[PDB]
Amino acid sequence: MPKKTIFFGAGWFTDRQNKAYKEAMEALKENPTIDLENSYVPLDNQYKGIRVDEHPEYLHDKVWATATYNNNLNGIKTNDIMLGVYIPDEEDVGLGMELGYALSQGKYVLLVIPDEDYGKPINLMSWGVSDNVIKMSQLKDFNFNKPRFDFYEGAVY
Amino acid sequence: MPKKTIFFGAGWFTDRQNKAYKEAMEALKENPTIDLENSYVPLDNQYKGIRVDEHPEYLHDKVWATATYNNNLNGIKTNDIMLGVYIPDEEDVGLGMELGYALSQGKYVLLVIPDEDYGKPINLMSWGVSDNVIKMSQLKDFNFNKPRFDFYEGAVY
Amino acid sequence: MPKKTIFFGAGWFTDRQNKAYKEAMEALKENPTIDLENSYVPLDNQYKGIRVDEHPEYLHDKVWATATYNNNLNGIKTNDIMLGVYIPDEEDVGLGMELGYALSQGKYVLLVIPDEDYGKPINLMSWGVSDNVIKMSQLKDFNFNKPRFDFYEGAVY
Amino acid sequence: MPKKTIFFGAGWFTDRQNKAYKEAMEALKENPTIDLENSYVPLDNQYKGIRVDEHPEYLHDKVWATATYNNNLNGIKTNDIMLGVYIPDEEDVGLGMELGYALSQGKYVLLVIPDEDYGKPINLMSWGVSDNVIKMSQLKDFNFNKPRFDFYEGAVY
Amino acid sequence: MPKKTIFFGAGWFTDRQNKAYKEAMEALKENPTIDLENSYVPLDNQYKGIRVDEHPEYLHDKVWATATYNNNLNGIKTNDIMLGVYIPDEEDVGLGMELGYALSQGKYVLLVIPDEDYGKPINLMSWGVSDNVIKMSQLKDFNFNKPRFDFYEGAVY
Amino acid sequence: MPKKTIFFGAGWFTDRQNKAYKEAMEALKENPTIDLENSYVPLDNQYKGIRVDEHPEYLHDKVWATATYNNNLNGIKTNDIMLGVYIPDEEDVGLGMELGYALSQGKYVLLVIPDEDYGKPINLMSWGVSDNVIKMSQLKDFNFNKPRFDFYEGAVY
Ligand SMILES: Nc1ccn([C@@H]2O[C@H](CO)[C@@H](O)[C@H]2O)c(=O)n1
Ligand SMILES: Nc1ccn([C@@H]2O[C@H](CO)[C@@H](O)[C@H]2O)c(=O)n1
Ligand SMILES: Nc1ccn([C@@H]2O[C@H](CO)[C@@H](O)[C@H]2O)c(=O)n1
Ligand SMILES: Nc1ccn([C@@H]2O[C@H](CO)[C@@H](O)[C@H]2O)c(=O)n1
Ligand SMILES: Nc1ccn([C@@H]2O[C@H](CO)[C@@H](O)[C@H]2O)c(=O)n1
Ligand SMILES: Nc1ccn([C@@H]2O[C@H](CO)[C@@H](O)[C@H]2O)c(=O)n1
Numbered sequence: 034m035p036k037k038t039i040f041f042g043a044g045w046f047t048d049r050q051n052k053a054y055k056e057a058m059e060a061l062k063e064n065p066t067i068d069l070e071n072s073y074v075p076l077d078n079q080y081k082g083i084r085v086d087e088h089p090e091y092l093h094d095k096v097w098a099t100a101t102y103n104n105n106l107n108g109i110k111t112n113d114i115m116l117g118v119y120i121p122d123e124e125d126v127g128l129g130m131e132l133g134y135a136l137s138q139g140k141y142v143l144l145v146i147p148d149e150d151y152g153k154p155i156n157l158m159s160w161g162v163s164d165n166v167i168k169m170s171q172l173k174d175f176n177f178n179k180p181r182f183d184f185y186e187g188a189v190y
Numbered sequence: 191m192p193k194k195t196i197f198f199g200a201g202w203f204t205d206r207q208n209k210a211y212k213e214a215m216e217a218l219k220e221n222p223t224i225d226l227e228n229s230y231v232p233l234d235n236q237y238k239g240i241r242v243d244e245h246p247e248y249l250h251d252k253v254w255a256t257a258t259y260n261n262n263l264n265g266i267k268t269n270d271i272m273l274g275v276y277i278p279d280e281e282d283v284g285l286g287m288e289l290g291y292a293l294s295q296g297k298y299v300l301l302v303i304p305d306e307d308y309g310k311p312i313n314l315m316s317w318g319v320s321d322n323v324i325k326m327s328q329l330k331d332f333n334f335n336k337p338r339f340d341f342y343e344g345a346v347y
Numbered sequence: 348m349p350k351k352t353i354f355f356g357a358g359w360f361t362d363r364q365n366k367a368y369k370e371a372m373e374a375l376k377e378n379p380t381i382d383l384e385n386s387y388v389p390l391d392n393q394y395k396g397i398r399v400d401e402h403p404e405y406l407h408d409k410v411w412a413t414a415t416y417n418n419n420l421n422g423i424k425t426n427d428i429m430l431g432v433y434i435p436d437e438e439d440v441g442l443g444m445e446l447g448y449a450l451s452q453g454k455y456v457l458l459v460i461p462d463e464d465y466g467k468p469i470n471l472m473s474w475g476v477s478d479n480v481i482k483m484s485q486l487k488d489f490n491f492n493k494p495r496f497d498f499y500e501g502a503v504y
Numbered sequence: 505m506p507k508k509t510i511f512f513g514a515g516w517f518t519d520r521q522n523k524a525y526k527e528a529m530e531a532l533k534e535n536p537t538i539d540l541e542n543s544y545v546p547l548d549n550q551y552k553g554i555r556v557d558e559h560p561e562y563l564h565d566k567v568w569a570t571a572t573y574n575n576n577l578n579g580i581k582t583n584d585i586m587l588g589v590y591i592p593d594e595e596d597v598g599l600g601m602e603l604g605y606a607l608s609q610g611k612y613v614l615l616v617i618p619d620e621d622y623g624k625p626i627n628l629m630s631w632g633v634s635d636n637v638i639k640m641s642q643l644k645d646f647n648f649n650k651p652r653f654d655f656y657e658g659a660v661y
Numbered sequence: 662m663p664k665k666t667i668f669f670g671a672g673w674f675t676d677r678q679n680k681a682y683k684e685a686m687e688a689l690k691e692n693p694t695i696d697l698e699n700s701y702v703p704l705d706n707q708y709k710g711i712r713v714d715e716h717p718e719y720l721h722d723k724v725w726a727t728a729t730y731n732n733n734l735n736g737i738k739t740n741d742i743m744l745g746v747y748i749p750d751e752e753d754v755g756l757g758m759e760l761g762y763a764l765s766q767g768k769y770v771l772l773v774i775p776d777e778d779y780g781k782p783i784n785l786m787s788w789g790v791s792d793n794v795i796k797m798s799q800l801k802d803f804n805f806n807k808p809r810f811d812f813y814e815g816a817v818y
Numbered sequence: 819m820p821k822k823t824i825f826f827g828a829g830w831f832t833d834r835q836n837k838a839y840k841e842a843m844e845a846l847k848e849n850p851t852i853d854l855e856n857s858y859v860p861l862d863n864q865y866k867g868i869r870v871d872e873h874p875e876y877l878h879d880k881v882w883a884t885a886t887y888n889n890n891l892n893g894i895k896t897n898d899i900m901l902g903v904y905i906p907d908e909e910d911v912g913l914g915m916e917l918g919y920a921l922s923q924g925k926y927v928l929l930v931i932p933d934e935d936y937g938k939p940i941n942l943m944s945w946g947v948s949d950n951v952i953k954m955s956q957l958k959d960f961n962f963n964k965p966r967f968d969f970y971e972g973a974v975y
Contacts, residue, residue, distance in 0.1 A: 035507075035542060037821075054548070071820060071963040078966070092345045094312065095724045096969075102318030104966040107949055110924045111965055126281035127315040133290020134319075138924045139581045139609045154249065158284035161259030162291075164578055178542040180582055181575040184567075188249040190203075190242060192699060228349060228492045235495065253498075253566045261496040264478050267453040268427075268494055270739075295453045296738040296766045321735050335699045338706065338738055339732040341724075360661075381584075385663060385806045392809065399661060406625065408657040410812075410880045416632030417648035418810040421792050424767040425741075425808055439630035447604020448633075452767045468563065472598040475573030502563045506821075506856060609962045610923045635892055649856040651896055652863070653888040655881075674975075683868065704953060719974040720939065730946030752911035755943035761918020762947075786912040789887030790919075816877045 036068035037177040040109045040135070043118035044125045045076060045137055048185035050118075053169065057118045060172035073108030079106060105131065110138045115130060119144040119166070121153035132162040141165075141180045145172050146187075187190050193225040194334040197292070200275035201282035202233060207275070210326065211305050212274045217329035224334060230265030237261065263291060271334055272297040274320070278310040289319040298322075298337040302329050311337045313347040350382040352447070352493040354423045357432035358439035359390060364432070367461050367483065371432045374486035387422030394418065414457060420448060427441040428491055431477070434466040446476040453496040455479075459486050468502040507539035507654075508648040511580045514589035515596045516547060524640065525560050528589045531643035538648060544579030551575060571605045576602065579619070585648055590615040590637070592624035603633040612636075612651045616643050617658075625659035664696040665805040668737045668763070671703050671746035672753035675706060678746070681775050681797065685746045688800035695805060701736030710733065734762060742805055743768040745791070749781040760790040769793075769808040782816040821853035822962040825894045825920070828903035829910045830861060835903075838954065842903045845957035852962060858893030863888060890916065895923045899962055904929040904951070906938035917947040921948050926950075926965045930957050931972075939973035 043057065044050040060182065061067050080100040083091055091097040107116060113134035118130050135142050144159065144166040151168040160166075166185040195201050200214065201207040204297050218226050233241070237247040237257035240248060248254045266272060274290035301316065308325040323342040324332060359365040359372065375383050390398070394414035397405060405411045423429060429449035431442050449456050458473065458480040465482040480499040481489060514528065515521040532538050551571040554562055562568040580586060588599050588605035606613050615630065615637040622639040631637075637656040638646065671685065672678040688695050704712070708728035711719060718723045737743060743763035763770050772787065772794040779796040783786050795803060796814040829835040830840065846852050862937040865885040868876055876882040894900060900920035902913050906951075919928050929944065936953040951970040952960065 035539065092347060095341055095727070098314060098317060098346050099723070099727050102314055103949070105315065106318075107317055107926065107965065107967045109875065111926050122859060123900065124283035125313075126283055126286035126311040129283035129286025130313075130315040130319050133287040133294065135290075137290065137294030141578065141582050156282075156284040156287075157255060157259055158262065158287040161263075162287050164574070179213045180578065182571060182578045184252055184571065189255050190249070192696070225349070252570070256566070256570050257496060257498065260478070264455065264494065264496045268455050298735065298739050321731070337735065340727060341728065342694045381913070382663070398645075400543065406661070409655055411627060412631055412660050413550065413880070413884050414810060414812065416628055417792070420632075421769065421808065421810045425769050437592060440595035440597055440600035441627040443597035443600025444604040444627075444629040444633050445606065447601045451608030457526075470598040470601075471573055471595075472576065472601040474569060475577075476601050498566055503569050504563060505851065510885065612896050633887070653885060653892045655885065657935065720975070723969055726942060726973040726974050730942055733943065734946075752912035754909035754911055756862060757911035757914025758918040758941075758943040758947050761915045761920075761922065765922030767916065777953075782911040784910075784915075785887055786890065786915040788897055789881060789891075790915050802832055817883050818877060 035063050035178050037113035038072045039114045039116045040112045041072060041074045042116055042128050042131050044123070044128065047123055049120050049123055053118050053120060054171050056147070057116070057172060060169065061185055062163055063173040063175070064175060066175070073112050075105060075108065078104055078108065083181050106134060107134050109140065113140070113181070115140045117142065117144045119146050119155065119159065121146065121150050121155050124159065127186060129159065133161065136162050141151045141169065143175070143180070145169055152187040154190045155185065157189050160185055160189045191222060192335050193223060194270035195225050195229045196209070196270045196273045197270045198229060198231045199273050199285045199315050201277070201280070201285060202278070203311050204280050206252055207282070208278055208306070209232065210275045210277060212345055213326050214273070214329055217326065220330040221247045221332065221334070232265065235261045235265060262288065265328050266292050266297065267295045270297070270327055271337065272299045274299065274301045276301040276303050276312065276323070278303065278307050278312050280311055281316065285318065289316065293319050300324065300332070300337070309344045311347045312342065313322070314346045317342055320339070348379060350380060351385045351427035352365045352382050353428045355386060355388045356430050356442045356445050358434070358442060359438070360439070361434070362436050362438070363434050363437055363461070367432045367434060368420050370483050371459055371486055373432070374483065377487040378489065378491070379401045380489070385403070387426050389409065389419055389422065389426045392418045392422060392488070419445065423449050423454065424452045427454070428494065429456045430483065431456065431458045432460040433460050433473065433480070435464050435469050438470055438473065443473065446473065450476050457481065459483055459493070461481055468504045469499065471503045474503045505536050506649050507537055508584035509543045510585045510587045511583045512543060512545045513587055513599050513602050515594070515599065518545070518594055520591050522592055524591060525588050526617055528587070528642050528643060531607065531640065534644040535646060535648070537646070544583050546576060546579065549575055549579065555597065575603060580606050580611065585612070586611045586613045588613065588615045590617050590626065590630065591606040592621050592626050595627060597632065599628050599654070600630065603630065607633050614638065614646070614651070616640055625661045628660050631656055631660045662693060665741035666696050666700045667742045667744045668740045669700060669702045669760050670744050670756045672748070672751070672756060674753070677751055677752050677775070678753070681746045684797050685744070685773055685800055686773070687703050687814060688797065691801040692803065694803070701740050701807070703733055703736065706732045706736060713735060716750070733759065737768065738766045743770045745770065745772045746776050747772040747774050747783065747787065747794070747802050749774065749778050749783050752784055752787065757787065759777065760787065764790050764800070771795065771803070771808070773797055780815045782818045783813065785817045788813055788817045820852050821847050821851055822898035823853050823857045824899045824901045826857060826859045827913050829908070829913065831846070832908055834905050834908055835917050838905060841932070841954050842901070842930055842957060845954065847955055848958040849960060849962070851960070853956045858897050860890060860893065863893065865890055891919060894920050896923065898925070899965070900925045900927045901927045902927065902945065904931050904940065906931065906935050906940050907928050908915055909941060909944065914944065915945065921947050928952065928960070930954055937972040939975045940970065942974050945974045
């Protein structure tokens with residue numbers, strides 16, 4: 034079984050983000066076509082250790098920001114597949130940027146939406162960058178070695 | 191006097207977005223380095239001239255979506271400069287994607303924030319993709335012939 | 348009145364190609380949004396000014412080929428708009444490659460088909476790379492300052 | 505033995521295409537550096553099942569075309585190597601486009617020509633996009649882990 | 662008379678670099694196809710207006726470096742043509758990187774070599790990235806509206 | 819243990835280059851995350867055999883140069899990681915070009931500097947293209963499966 038690495042695109046601000054985060058991570062743990070160990074998970078890759086939760090003064094530090102921004106781009110460009118954990122009611126400008134970067138870097142762009150949310154409207158441009166969008170319950174068995182193009186069965190605005 | 195064209199990146203989904211939209215458009219009309227006539231305004235380039243909020247029968251039309259998505263990419267790639275009307279409290283996933291696309295197309299990426307909001311934290315990834323960020327009241331006089339890189343006078347989250 | 352430059356993508360290997368070539372060139376001469384003088388015409392930019400059909404000693408010259416190939420890429424990348432004079436029944440692999448290159452360089456990709464052939468099926472991949480396709484008789488009046496995406500009024504095979 | 509995946513670029517219209525198709529497929533089956541299972545073969549990836557042979561009404565469907573076009577680009581961008589089964593007498597605009605896309609996506613671009621045809625003239629731009637061109641009989645033993653640049657020993661037009 | 666802008670690629674780290682710098686700048690002032698006013702000159706675009714050789718406190722400032730690096734990339738991407746003032750005996754790693762970046766941004770890459778040095782061997786990779794190379798005394802009259810590919814009249818090492 | 823391939827970017831002119839070359843090669847031989855066998859080493863990939871050491875007439879041959887230039891680009895684009903063996907006192911325009919190419923091709927760009935030299939000033943643009951710069955003694959244990967962004971702890975000019 035060949036395995037692909039992913040960039041774990043996902044917010045961690047809100048309760049719905051955190052729930053979807055935990056679920057997507059569990060699905061990837063079960064997916065035999067994913068090498069999670071060698072995948073890039075932003076939350077586990079805080080520059081120089083420094084946790085911004087505990088030291089918010091770093092949010093005005095240009096060096097911290099440059100390094101964190103660059104680490105994210107690096108994580109996208111050096112991994113096989115771009116994953117976007119996507120909450121239709123809580124769409125994220127940062128994830129959006131990353132989707133557009135991933136597109137430019139020639140990566141497959143997979144959005145994953147919670148089953149309870151699948152079908153709800155998403156932004157045209159999110160709809161368009163995506164090569165495919167699936168429900169959370171399909172993530173554990175998605176074949177990342179044979180990724181295909183498909184359309185969201187759902188609304189755009 | 192050389193003139194550049196822009197892509198008008200902006201949400202139109204809240205009252206603060208719409209207010210910023212109207213102000214930015216007025217500033218561009220007054221800027222002697224911008225050719226607004228030959229610029230791309232997404233809201234005037236929707237497929238078949240139809241907005242999905244005014245004709246919700248198009249919410250699941252895949253042809254309308256494909257064409258509108260593609261028209262936007264074309265608007266970014268064929269114009270000189272990428273503009274992002276940006277509300278820190280109401281950031282737009284669609285604009286984010288477009289910032290990433292613009293970066294891929296080698297365009298200058300200028301964010302413009304209402305004066306009342308300038309200085310407030312913005313998303314890391316918006317901070318990073320952007321080449322520069324200014325107050326709404328600076329847009330009318332910005333020299334688009336000599337565009338330069340600068341850091342936002344403001345924090346990220 | 349702003350003017351754009353074009354790369355003149357066109358075969359010259361059949362009578363219908365050559366007829367379309369001559370017509371497209373005449374239309375461009377009359378289009379007030381085109382600067383034809385500073386446009387790239389492949390047939391005037393062959394290495395050492397020599398065409399391989401008139402001097403078949405060059406059929407295996409690797410230097411002539413490298414230079415002519417590279418001159419074409421340079422012609423696409425340094426001009427505003429990619430034009431493809433396109434015969435549905437006599438499609439050209441060389442033009443196809445160039446359509447792909449132009450896409451990579453972020454150029455508007457306009458196919459122009461003789462009126463007598465407009466509406467006939469074209470290759471899927473030509474249909475997709477193209478931003479738009481028009482009849483020969485529309486080329487003289489096309490506004491290259493406001494280029495937009497549209498679907499071919501026609502089938503694919 | 506590391507293995508690479510390919511996109512199987514090849515027409516299936518004519519008798520010469522079909523013969524070369526069958527031969528190239530057999531060679532890849534024998535090549536220990538190719539993972540054919542996880543490679544993208546357009547003919548086995550018809551969108552939503554729908555075979556256009558049996559339902560030609562889909563050739564005027566914009567959604568079918570968008571999806572099929574995108575599936576092909578996706579198959580090129582997500583695989584390691586671009587293969588072009590190339591018939592000098594029957595050159596294909598669609599394959600051409602794909603070669604240019606593959607180039608832009610940073611892939612090795614390998615043309616394979618039937619032994620009976622190797623040496624016959626090919627288009628300059630096909631000659632140029634290619635990183636290498638080989639005879640059909642060399643495909644089964646080509647080392648895809650150590651791909652090199654070389655010139656076609658043959659004519660261009 | 663159409664005018665193009667340039668990025669002024671040049672070292673300033675030896676006497677021969679500086680002499681070539683001054684000569685190239687004078688030639689550009691006289692070239693009727695160049696808009697020098699709206700061109701990017703790296704030495705006038707250092708972050709905070711400070712040169713590290715005049716203020717060595719900035720030798721380890723990561724913010725100064727990030728901004729100056731980014732300003733240069735922006736200068737290449739937003740101007741029409743990439744110029745490289747090139748000393749065969751004193752080749753510059755920084756300019757080299759920029760040649761590669763310019764290639765990525767689809768810009769014409771023109772090297773200009775002092776007359777006294779024109780014809781001397783240059784690095785293979787400089788020879789290859791360049792679209793063309795000329796003598797300093799040709800820069801004042803070069804037609805930047807019709808830029809073409811040519812091989813250096815000179816060797817590589 | 820997954821393994822990545824590299825392009826071995828390094829000069830071989832001077833005594834310091836040759837020493838660093840030998841050391842970097844030995845470190846890669848010891849690194850379990852590198853597949854050196856399938857990596858691209860320019861010095862072992864002389865076109866058509868022809869060694870330029872022994873036949874310097876090839877330095878004025880345009881075909882030799884085209885092929886060697888292209889083989890290098892091909893070696894960068896088809897491998898996972900770009901390595902630059904970097905001597906601060908002897909910076910190389912060719913390596914510079916390759917770094918910029920690698921960046922454009924979405925590769926991780928790792929500079930490696932001799933321990934005796936680590937901390938010495940390097941060009942701004944080398945500092946910027948790099949995703950990371952390490953000392954020679956860290957190369958044997960660098961985890962190429964989890965590459966990260968970091969800043970040189972050293973001077974720029
Ligand atoms: N402080 C921050 C803010 C944003 N991010 C990146 O941006 C996405 C969420 O906006 C996430 O996918 C994440 O990669 C980050 O890493 N750190
Ligand atoms: N229905 C829609 C939705 C989005 N957009 C594009 O995306 C941004 C707004 O999210 C805008 O910047 C716009 O380009 C659009 O054009 N039409
Ligand atoms: N001998 C040749 C052959 C091809 N071409 C380029 O490719 C297209 C014609 O196939 C044309 O669009 C042209 O750019 C060329 O320039 N010279
Ligand atoms: N109806 C069609 C037409 C074309 N193609 C793609 O284009 C190439 C042949 O033109 C082939 O390589 C194939 O990928 C396709 O998939 N379906
Ligand atoms: N301190 C520095 C060092 C380098 N540069 C850029 O890189 C080239 C000179 O190496 C120049 O072409 C210039 O663009 C710079 O701008 N500032
Ligand atoms: N004659 C030459 C000259 C240069 N090179 C490539 O350029 C880098 C050193 O300049 C090296 O990294 C090497 O790839 C080459 O291969 N052959």
